[PDB]
Amino acid sequence: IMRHLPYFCRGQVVRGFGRGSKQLGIPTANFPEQVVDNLPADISTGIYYGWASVGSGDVHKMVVSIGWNPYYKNTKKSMETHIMHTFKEDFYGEILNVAIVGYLRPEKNFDSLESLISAIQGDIEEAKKRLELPEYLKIKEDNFFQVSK
Ligand SMILES: Cc1cc2nc3c(=O)[nH]c(=O)nc-3n(C[C@H](O)[C@H](O)[C@H](O)COP(=O)(O)O)c2cc1C
Ligand SMILES: Nc1ncnc2c1ncn2[C@@H]1O[C@H](COP(=O)(O)OP(=O)(O)O)[C@@H](O)[C@H]1O
Ligand SMILES: [Mg+2]
């Protein structure tokens, strides 16, 4: 009902299970439990696409997962952002600025690491396309991000 995205929020980038880069070749920046549990109720668990900036850096496209990761069966709900951008160094401890702008699909279980990697890869592409809609690109100019720098 709060599908009145975009939804903005900032979170400190903290350690996850060490699975993204290591198992999937897809790192995700993880938010602290306090940020996740304080998310608006209307935000469903699932996979979204949107914008993000690390610190006072530039805004880039991204996909973010909000849930329990059915494949790994996590106990605590998480919020993980994968930015479609190549960074030279890791940014643990930095503040990640985020704008969730659209819903892609819900979290799923898979029969193999391969199937999951492939689905995630799929979200990234779909995201790459949808974020081009001008209505969405404007979001990238929102004051919320101008203040980041
Ligand atoms: C766009 C995207 C889609 C995802 N979809 C699923 C999913 O459908 N099922 C699932 O179990 N985990 C999903 N994940 C979460 C990953 O399983 C998780 O980020 C990965 O295991 C790394 O965890 P970590 O950051 O603690 O190392 C998704 C993550 C991203 C970024
Ligand atoms: N494009 C990116 N998107 C998200 N994180 C990135 C990216 N590039 C580098 N990183 C680094 O990788 C980390 C996440 O990697 P991951 O393997 O999921 O480890 P973790 O389980 O500790 O979050 C981020 O905290 C960040 O420091
Ligand atoms: Mg991660």
Q: Is residue 80 flagged as an active site residue?
A: yes
The CA radius of gyration of the chain, in Å to the nearest whole number, is 14
Return the CATH number at 88.
2.40.30.30
Report the number of distinct structural domains present in the chain: 1
- CA–CA distances in Å: residue 45 to residues 56, 70, 117: 28, 11, 19
From 80, 94, 114, 132, active-site residue: 80
PDB resolution in Å: 2.4
Amino acid making up residue 119: A
Residue 20: name the closest of 53, 64, 58, 54 by CA: 64
* Residue-number span of the structural domain to which 64 is assigned: 1-149
Cα–ligand 1 centroid distance for 119 (angstroms):
10
For residue 76, with 0-12 CB atoms within 10 Å meaning exposed, 13-18 middle and 19 or more buried, which class applies?
Answer: exposed
Residue where the block lists tokens 């304080």: 38
- CA–CA distances in Å: residue 115 to residues 24, 56, 108, 120: 11, 35, 11, 9
Ligand 1, atom 15: closest residue by C-alpha: 69
For residue 80, with 0-12 CB atoms within 10 Å meaning exposed, 13-18 middle and 19 or more buried, which class applies?
Answer: buried
